[PDB]
Write a protein that binds this ligand. Sequence first.
Ligand SMILES: NC(=O)c1ccc[n+]([C@@H]2O[C@H](COP(=O)([O-])OP(=O)(O)OC[C@H]3O[C@@H](n4cnc5c(N)ncnc54)[C@H](O)[C@@H]3O)[C@@H](O)[C@H]2O)c1
Ligand SMILES: NC(=O)c1ccc[n+]([C@@H]2O[C@H](COP(=O)([O-])OP(=O)(O)OC[C@H]3O[C@@H](n4cnc5c(N)ncnc54)[C@H](O)[C@@H]3O)[C@@H](O)[C@H]2O)c1
Ligand SMILES: N/C(=C/C=C/C=O)C(=O)O
Ligand SMILES: N/C(=C/C=C/C=O)C(=O)O
Ligand code: NA
Ligand code: NA
Ligand code: NA
Ligand code: NA
Lengths: 483, 483, 483, 483
Amino acid sequence: SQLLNYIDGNFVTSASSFANINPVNGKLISDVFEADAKQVNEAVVAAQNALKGPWGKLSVQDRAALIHKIADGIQARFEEFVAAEVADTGRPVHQARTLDIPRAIANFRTFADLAKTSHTDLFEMSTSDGSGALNYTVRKPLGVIGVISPWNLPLLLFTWKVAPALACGNTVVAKPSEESPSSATLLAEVMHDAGVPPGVFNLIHGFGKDSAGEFLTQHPGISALTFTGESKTGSTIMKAVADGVKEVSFELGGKNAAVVFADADLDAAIEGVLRSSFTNSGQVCLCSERVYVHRSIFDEFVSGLKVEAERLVVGYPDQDGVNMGPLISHGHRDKVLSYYRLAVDEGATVVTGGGVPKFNDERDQGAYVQPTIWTGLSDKARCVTEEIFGPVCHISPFDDEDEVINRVNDSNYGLACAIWTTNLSRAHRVSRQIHVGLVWVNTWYLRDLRTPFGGVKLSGLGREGGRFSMDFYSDIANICIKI
Amino acid sequence: SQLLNYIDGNFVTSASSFANINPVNGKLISDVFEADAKQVNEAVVAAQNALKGPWGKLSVQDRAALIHKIADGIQARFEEFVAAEVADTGRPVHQARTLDIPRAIANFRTFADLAKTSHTDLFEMSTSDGSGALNYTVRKPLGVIGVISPWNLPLLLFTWKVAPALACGNTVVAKPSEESPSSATLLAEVMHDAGVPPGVFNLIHGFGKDSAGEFLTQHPGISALTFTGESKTGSTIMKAVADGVKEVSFELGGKNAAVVFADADLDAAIEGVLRSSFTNSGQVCLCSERVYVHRSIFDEFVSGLKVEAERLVVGYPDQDGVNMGPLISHGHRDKVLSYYRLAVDEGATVVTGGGVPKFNDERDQGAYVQPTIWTGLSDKARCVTEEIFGPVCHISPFDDEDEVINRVNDSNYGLACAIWTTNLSRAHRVSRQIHVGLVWVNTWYLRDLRTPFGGVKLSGLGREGGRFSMDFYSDIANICIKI
Amino acid sequence: SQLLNYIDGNFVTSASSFANINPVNGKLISDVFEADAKQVNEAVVAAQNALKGPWGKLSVQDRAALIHKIADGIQARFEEFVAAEVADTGRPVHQARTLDIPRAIANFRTFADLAKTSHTDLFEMSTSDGSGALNYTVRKPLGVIGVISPWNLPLLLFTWKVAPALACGNTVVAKPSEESPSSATLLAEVMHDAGVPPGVFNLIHGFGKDSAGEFLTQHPGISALTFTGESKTGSTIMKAVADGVKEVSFELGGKNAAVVFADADLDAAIEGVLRSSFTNSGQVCLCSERVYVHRSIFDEFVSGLKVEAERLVVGYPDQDGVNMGPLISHGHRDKVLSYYRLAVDEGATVVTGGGVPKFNDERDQGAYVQPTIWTGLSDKARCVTEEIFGPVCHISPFDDEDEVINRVNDSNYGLACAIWTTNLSRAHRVSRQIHVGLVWVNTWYLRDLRTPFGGVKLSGLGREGGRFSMDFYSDIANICIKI
Amino acid sequence: SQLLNYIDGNFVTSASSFANINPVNGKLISDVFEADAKQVNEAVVAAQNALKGPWGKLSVQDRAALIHKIADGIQARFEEFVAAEVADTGRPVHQARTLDIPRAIANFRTFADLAKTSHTDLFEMSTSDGSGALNYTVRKPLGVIGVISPWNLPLLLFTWKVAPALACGNTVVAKPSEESPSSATLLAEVMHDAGVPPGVFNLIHGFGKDSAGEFLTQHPGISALTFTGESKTGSTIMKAVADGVKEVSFELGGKNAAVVFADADLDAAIEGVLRSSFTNSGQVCLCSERVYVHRSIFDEFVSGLKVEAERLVVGYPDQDGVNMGPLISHGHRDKVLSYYRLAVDEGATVVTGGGVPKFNDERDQGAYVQPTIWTGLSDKARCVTEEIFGPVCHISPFDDEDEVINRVNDSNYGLACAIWTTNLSRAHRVSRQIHVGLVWVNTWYLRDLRTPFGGVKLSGLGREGGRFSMDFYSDIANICIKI
Ligand SMILES: NC(=O)c1ccc[n+]([C@@H]2O[C@H](COP(=O)([O-])OP(=O)(O)OC[C@H]3O[C@@H](n4cnc5c(N)ncnc54)[C@H](O)[C@@H]3O)[C@@H](O)[C@H]2O)c1
Ligand SMILES: NC(=O)c1ccc[n+]([C@@H]2O[C@H](COP(=O)([O-])OP(=O)(O)OC[C@H]3O[C@@H](n4cnc5c(N)ncnc54)[C@H](O)[C@@H]3O)[C@@H](O)[C@H]2O)c1
Ligand SMILES: N/C(=C/C=C/C=O)C(=O)O
Ligand SMILES: N/C(=C/C=C/C=O)C(=O)O
Ligand code: NA
Ligand code: NA
Ligand code: NA
Ligand code: NA
């Protein structure tokens, strides 16, 4: 199996390739051709030229129809996209079938519909001469959008950027994660077969530093760079585009908290924290890695979570009641295990997990770790402050509302928080005080695609979702008519 | 000792001072105390802490009321602010009276009012269990806003950032331009006298690199950096805040065009382009330095503009009938003169101006240049592509509408453009094709503070004005309640 | 052929029927069963009950998909709908094919999309105890919407109401005009076949006074009455629902003007006024029956419009170059011809038309009239002030812009106006001074479904279109949470 | 004392007059001149003319500044306004000082501010020839607004209509209630002294049927009638305006419920129901005349409420700790006492009150009644279904959530509801099911002037508040420019 770049309407190979590895068993899935600087340039130039071709003359309604045809194309190959996402990442098949792929299709449909309904503003004004003036605003395409996406929710996060980019009449050069290149390449096929004009959507494979990603960010031809990934990489990209003053939108890390108050529905909180800590094997930027539980219910909470975490099934993506697959890769598992040892060194009690499961089959050649719960660390421990991106949480007691609010907010990140309480006042009082972009009360990762999505502090720059995406991916121009 | 910093509610001197010079005659106006790194830290820390004090507890209505008291405080000292702006910049007194100071007051009133009226969003959604969920958004203060402003419209541009910063509940550390420090110091006294709590507004004086401006951009304590000035500085600042992923908002250079079609009201277009080229001695980022005129009216337009340009009175701010003051400084004047020589070397015809007037009085020790009009340069000439920021324009003929739109858009900048035509279709057809943030038709620099304002390409990052300011200066947080 | 009512999911007959006549030739097309008071009650009760059934449990996404299925169902029978609308009204087949049916389809898709994208408002407030409160708004179904619709654009106007009613989660009882019952009945079949739950959409046939129309209007079980028709009929309905204080939305008559300024594109204005006067044989509420032309071009306009009007082909719906069909009915034609006589009596010059064409075939038993142009009437003549609703216009000269604005506005109606000018300022200066809900400049009846649509004075009550429809067909409820 | 009409900038008497009675003591406060049909016509004509005068040329900023001067003018006579509202209505001085007068002032400031920030829409569209079109909307004054208002919150409700009417550039003819004419007359003096141009605001005194109220509603020169009062009066007005198809906004009766769930904070709910039942002596449309309390806390609630109700001090507006003043008049007291008798006859148990207090002083000639609580009535009793508009409530037990929702909704009215509960899910789940315009959770009559305010069913037609006012009191016109 081979994964090509898609540049200016053609699938093309490159001089260099790399391996796509299945994290379940360590086996080779495919070879991937790495785009060089020359090919990146060729993509950017093609995307510039496509803005002046047929794509550029489509009405908003016709553009929207064509984006719906993209969505239809993915739906028509639904189970192929499921298989590609599962192979790259080891995610449970049921998750790919119910979240990953349908979200990617819904991304396209939501932004196609938003492109149809969206309008702009009219401002009347008086003038000295008494005849007045009119200011009106219009949305135009920004230009070429460079898209660089991560491996944790491959098609979902890729199409989260590509859908609004296209719905706003932009052209795109997109570089998916080297760990999860498959579903993006299938998306290129769907674009091609749906009649998307050449150069509108281009797909380049590769790495970051000294590869496709870097070259993309350095290219003077782009108008914007949208990115999801690690905070440090965000900082690096922000420096890279600075000489062009390119528009930027970043969704970066977090070290998210969950807070369980004494009035919580306890079993529901246990189940919710189980999901918020261990979904996708802890490899969602939204996962809870720090948990604060009121002292009066702390012991019972920890006990209850231990029992649920030990019933989790860790294994094959299509295994009967599977809850967790492996980590994305052996190198990622190295990092996570390194943090597992660090916690023990910082004085953690390992309530459960803390190692790798023994399967006695091919899974032992994969990148699995156990779901892990810690207790006993101070708020300043490295394991409680640095993003681990694995299936782990630390649980700490608290006593007072104002105290726990300060502890959640004592972080250089600020992406998301989940709070558990049955009390009306507390939900709204406490939520508004958490320094994050996204708070859930009595749930986790419930998404309405119209809402603003983003983080604060190190977790983000800007906001996407609904009209924020329509504003980010558009040139907003103001036209003033003196009457 | 004359202009002090204002930090945590006290005027404070510093270890060194620098001279503030009157560009009308080169005389010393005052000594300005240059904030050092420790003082910049103190200000940022004070601004951090003020977010937890009484300022953080004010209702939106009470905050708005206090901002209106700031406005009223400026108004109460109106003629002092006029004299300060005039002294620093040499602006004609009638212009500081009618444009600069009143706009600064209007900035505070508008954003105070937007703060009281602005609301957020409610999204209802269905869930699996049939009970639904609610997502709602709220605006909160972003944090500490660092404000770095230019010398060309000192109080106007400084308050354009400070007013929405404060209206959104933030605290501020603001660094005015070293060339025009006086009005911003008076503003500090107004804040003090209105009872703004300590730490909420802090003024620091100094330069950029290795001085107060650079220190502010590098401080990890700010949440955002808003800047107006040269594109090159914008790039430097973007790199500096990168490691912190600070929110950024930039209004940068342009090389703006005016276009005059054959069906323009010729007299009105001549007067309009005279204003657009020579207002504030050509020192507005919105000024036209490139003018394109349909060949049928080219000679008449040029002849007319020469006549009107040579009637401009260049002189004292309180001189009878004065139209233009000096440039901001001798250093700026040397840069503009360096372009006046370069234009001649690149082959220009000097229609008028091209040097410095000879006053035979103390004005010869100031920083005056003549209003200049060039003809005969090619589109790739440096004087037609690089921002000069003086009272100059090049006039070129054109023949076809698609041609002139290409020539307007063939620029690394994209701030603003002015079009002159009486034809309904052409106005709207042409305006939407110009790749800028702001187009005026049959006028120039008509401002409605509700409109989105900014540039594209090198001319900017983001938008401000109306709801775009309210969104930039706020954290937008989404709270999701499972029902 | 017989046309049944559709009540609670079943097609049902009634004790009485009335004839549906083809206005082309006077032949019987079908018998239509008239709903009595008991059946209207049954439809209302069914509609009330369906709000408590499955319909009321659908998510907005699922409701929207069902409404898209209605639209697809129309599209799948597109040519049957075309044939139906043509048979009832005599409209040219190509007009039914390009305007009427595609717009009915688009009505459904537009409002389905709006239902998915629309959201409500979140208002935060401070309280005396310092804890604050939240106000959030929600859109709920208003309840049972009664829809009464006219014969001039039967399916388009019927669906213009039914689509947002359904999209907002309401149930409907709809009474189409007795002159054009066929396409509505067909729509009831599409509804049935698409699986719309019983009682959600009910169709009742009949007349107004002393019939289905009036009974619907009097039923205490409805929550709103939306209506398009004669202003006098609006007034009657407003009286009828007053005791229940029902929500009302009315789009009523007009006596619309076109204004042609001296700088108009003359041949384009001639063609535009031809269309605005004689489309659908002048039977559109938006038609121009008053035309004002600048004195300097009056004679040449009148001359040119005469020639174009006499080239119109008046004939069979599928006849080769056909432009106009008959009037809707003999009764309407009696009324139009009465005005034709009145005009001559009031002193008109008949420039063209003024009678009935003579075909010497079966069309002579239909309801045809000639396209007619008058001159020479004063502004007070009844033929110039009262709505005729036939293919007629009166042309008068003017000299001065303010004068013609006054003469346009001197009316008890205020639906629409069309202005012809090539001048940028005039277009905007004049448009804003016309006291109507809709102005077109250099075009007529160009529709964007997001815009507010409606009239002033006797021409309307309320606005519909875009968010205006979403607000009218919803209960907007405010919920205030003390924190 | 005499109260004059204010018509075209002059105070004028009439041929007929009526007595304004102080309800504390039955003494004559003033004689009021009753406008006749000719005076009403004179006011409407003057309002129509003033739309073409200096008022119509004000910029939105200058109009807003003039509206703020009206507000300032009220504030400068603050104690006079307080004395006037007290004299007319008997309302406690403390509450006129803190609710009534301050709210009237805030109505003007809020709508003045909205007027300055409000803007309209721009819609871009494709056309067949590829050139496109623009639709933009503008807000214009609707015309002459007729304002008819009730006696319960005289200045607050009067200004709630007058402020947005004026802020939207309309002119006004206003008829305050015959029972509370004083503060409105004072307001005409403030308008006059603030320099409001003659004819912009006209005040006419009189009654409803066969008097100034009716004459206004029949006058063909008005563009809109906004009304607050009894439902049956709304129905009558809606018939009166029907032949002109005038725009109408009605805020009408309610029979509002409060619901106290078992998990409510009990003492807070008692205090809250006390306020919601007996504020302004129960003469607020928003008052709770029906209370439902969960069975498990019913007896304890009734007992607590009994105690609080008997601690209320009923007496002079300026008496020490007065809580309640008299009813508005003797005629209204006769109606309320009639209901107090009916309740006994319907089987009610009188927990407290039920008659009139005994003062043995001039208050015996007033219109006082006692705070009254009933128990024991069925859901169909007249006293539980009909609006009494006095200081009374009936308390009833309930068992189940769905049950109480059905019972609250089982009404021909639908204005407001208050719910008491500490539970997050319950609050949001139950609130959205209550068929009213306004739900308060854990509070009552908490007002944010931006929110939509209105009722459903017999309780109203339309919404006012924030943008809903700006939309009602403006003509929204759509201008379509073909490019
Ligand atoms: N887009 C707009 O709206 C707009 C408006 C006005 C001015 N401008 C641009 O502003 C320029 C005005 O000139 P200027 O010479 O004041 O610009 P500048 O960029 O040299 O200086 C602007 C400010 O930045 C500070 N500064 C300079 N170097 C810095 C550094 N390394 N770190 C941090 N702060 C630093 C300065 O002290 C000053 O306060 C022109 O380019 C003009 O077009 C743009
Ligand atoms: N927002 C609301 O829903 C709201 C608010 C406050 C009061 N109210 C209602 O107010 C009522 C108490 O007020 P009210 O007794 O003053 O009501 P009312 O209806 O008898 O009269 C109110 C106003 O209407 C005038 N009026 C009476 N009959 C008229 C007619 N035929 N034509 C024209 N005008 C006429 C009166 O002179 C007075 O100015 C209660 O029903 C209460 O629910 C409703
Ligand atoms: N649903 C989403 C999950 C995202 C995680 C990081 O963005 C999203 O981003 O849209
Ligand atoms: N505060 C208010 C009370 C209104 C009661 C009836 O309208 C209001 O209307 O603003
Ligand atoms: Na992989
Ligand atoms: Na200076
Ligand atoms: Na018919
Ligand atoms: Na009275």
